[PDB]
Design a protein around this motif. Structure first.
Motif, PDB file in Angstrom:
ATOM      1  N   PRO A   1      13.183   9.930  -5.997  1.00 46.24           N
ATOM      2  CA  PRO A   1      13.978   9.076  -5.090  1.00 46.24           C
ATOM      3  C   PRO A   1      13.273   7.760  -4.756  1.00 46.24           C
ATOM      4  N   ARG A   2      14.036   6.782  -4.251  1.00 45.56           N
ATOM      5  CA  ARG A   2      13.469   5.472  -3.882  1.00 45.56           C
ATOM      6  C   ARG A   2      12.509   5.622  -2.685  1.00 45.56           C
ATOM      7  N   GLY A   3      11.664   4.615  -2.465  1.00 46.98           N
ATOM      8  CA  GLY A   3      10.678   4.693  -1.393  1.00 46.98           C
ATOM      9  C   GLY A   3       9.289   5.058  -1.892  1.00 46.98           C
ATOM     10  N   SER A   4       8.446   5.488  -0.957  1.00 43.62           N
ATOM     11  CA  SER A   4       7.050   5.758  -1.247  1.00 43.62           C
ATOM     12  C   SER A   4       6.877   7.124  -1.884  1.00 43.62           C
ATOM     13  N   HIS A   5       5.815   7.247  -2.672  1.00 42.73           N
ATOM     14  CA  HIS A   5       5.457   8.479  -3.344  1.00 42.73           C
ATOM     15  C   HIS A   5       3.989   8.763  -3.070  1.00 42.73           C
ATOM     16  N   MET A   6       3.702   9.927  -2.511  1.00 46.17           N
ATOM     17  CA  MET A   6       2.342  10.309  -2.187  1.00 46.17           C
ATOM     18  C   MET A   6       1.890  11.437  -3.130  1.00 46.17           C
ATOM     19  N   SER A   7       0.848  11.166  -3.914  1.00 46.24           N
ATOM     20  CA  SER A   7       0.246  12.171  -4.810  1.00 46.24           C
ATOM     21  C   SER A   7      -1.153  12.493  -4.380  1.00 46.24           C
ATOM     22  N   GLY A   8      -1.742  11.627  -3.592  1.00 46.13           N
ATOM     23  CA  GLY A   8      -3.046  12.007  -3.147  1.00 46.13           C
ATOM     24  C   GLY A   8      -3.131  13.021  -2.009  1.00 46.13           C
ATOM     25  N   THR A   9      -4.302  13.015  -1.393  1.00 48.50           N
ATOM     26  CA  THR A   9      -4.517  13.646  -0.125  1.00 48.50           C
ATOM     27  C   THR A   9      -4.661  12.535   0.884  1.00 48.50           C
ATOM     28  N   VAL A  10      -3.908  12.635   1.971  1.00 47.92           N
ATOM     29  CA  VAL A  10      -4.139  11.790   3.126  1.00 47.92           C
ATOM     30  C   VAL A  10      -4.550  12.699   4.297  1.00 47.92           C
ATOM     31  N   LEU A  11      -5.606  12.285   5.007  1.00 46.76           N
ATOM     32  CA  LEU A  11      -6.049  12.958   6.228  1.00 46.76           C
ATOM     33  C   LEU A  11      -5.613  12.144   7.435  1.00 46.76           C
ATOM     34  N   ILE A  12      -4.969  12.813   8.391  1.00 48.80           N
ATOM     35  CA  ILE A  12      -4.541  12.205   9.645  1.00 48.80           C
ATOM     36  C   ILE A  12      -5.523  12.716  10.716  1.00 48.80           C
ATOM     37  N   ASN A  13      -6.166  11.787  11.426  1.00 51.08           N
ATOM     38  CA  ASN A  13      -7.236  12.148  12.363  1.00 51.08           C
ATOM     39  C   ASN A  13      -7.485  11.078  13.430  1.00 51.08           C
ATOM     40  N   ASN A  14      -6.472  10.787  14.242  1.00 49.55           N
ATOM     41  CA  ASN A  14      -6.632   9.904  15.410  1.00 49.55           C
ATOM     42  C   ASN A  14      -7.333  10.647  16.564  1.00 49.55           C
ATOM     43  N   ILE A  15      -7.968   9.905  17.470  1.00 49.72           N
ATOM     44  CA  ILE A  15      -8.697  10.528  18.592  1.00 49.72           C
ATOM     45  C   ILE A  15      -7.890  10.494  19.884  1.00 49.72           C
ATOM     46  N   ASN A  16      -7.948  11.594  20.642  1.00 41.52           N
ATOM     47  CA  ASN A  16      -7.298  11.694  21.955  1.00 41.52           C
ATOM     48  C   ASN A  16      -7.362  10.365  22.715  1.00 41.52           C
TER      49      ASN A  16
END
Length: 156
Positions: A1-16
């Motif tokens: 489909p159109r739009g972004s394609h993620m094949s990697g690993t992304v880590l989400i890690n914001n701080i409180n």
């Protein structure tokens, strides 16, 4: 489909900031490819990450990894929030981050969508805390909010 394609690993890690992490918001549509990993459980001290896709979400068999302090309905948890429609298949792995385990009433909300196809998210691996086994469900224990996905528990 159109739009972004993620094949990697992304880590989400914001701080409180100061008690809960800021959500990471991504605009547009996303396709999570088969070798894709979106991992929110990167720090037991900052459980409660949120990935927000401001668009549709298409899974091709990639994995969403969440952490949760597994207990009852009010468990602190990482979450995925999709502004649009979820389709395809995305696997969901959940890791207990110091939860005792408890019986749920309606379930722990972990994913929200505008709408989801049947089995848009599929559990990968057992989810255990204390003496409780948790299972992925579309909609709550009683069938409410079927555009949201929940973890319901039973004695193991």
């Amino acid at each position: 489909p159109r739009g972004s394609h993620m094949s990697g690993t992304v880590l989400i890690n914001n701080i409180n900031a100061p008690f809960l992490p800021d959500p990471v918001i991504v605009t547009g549509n996303m396709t999570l490819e088969k070798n894709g990993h979106v991992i929110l459980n990167n720090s037991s001290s900052n459980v409660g990450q949120t990935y927000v896709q401001k668009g549709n979400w298409h899974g091709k068999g990639g994995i969403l990894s969440l952490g949760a302090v597994l207990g009852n309905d009010n468990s602190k948890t990482d979450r995925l929030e999709i502004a649009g429609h979820a389709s395809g298949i995305t696997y969901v792995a959940v890791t207990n981050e110091g939860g005792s385990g408890d019986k749920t009433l309606e379930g722990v909300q972990i994913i929200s969508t505008d709408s989801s196809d049947k089995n848009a998210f599929i559990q990968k691996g057992r989810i255990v805390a204390g003496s409780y086994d948790y299972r992925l469900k579309q909609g709550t224990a009683s069938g409410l909010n079927t555009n949201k996905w929940y973890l319901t528990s039973q004695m193991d």
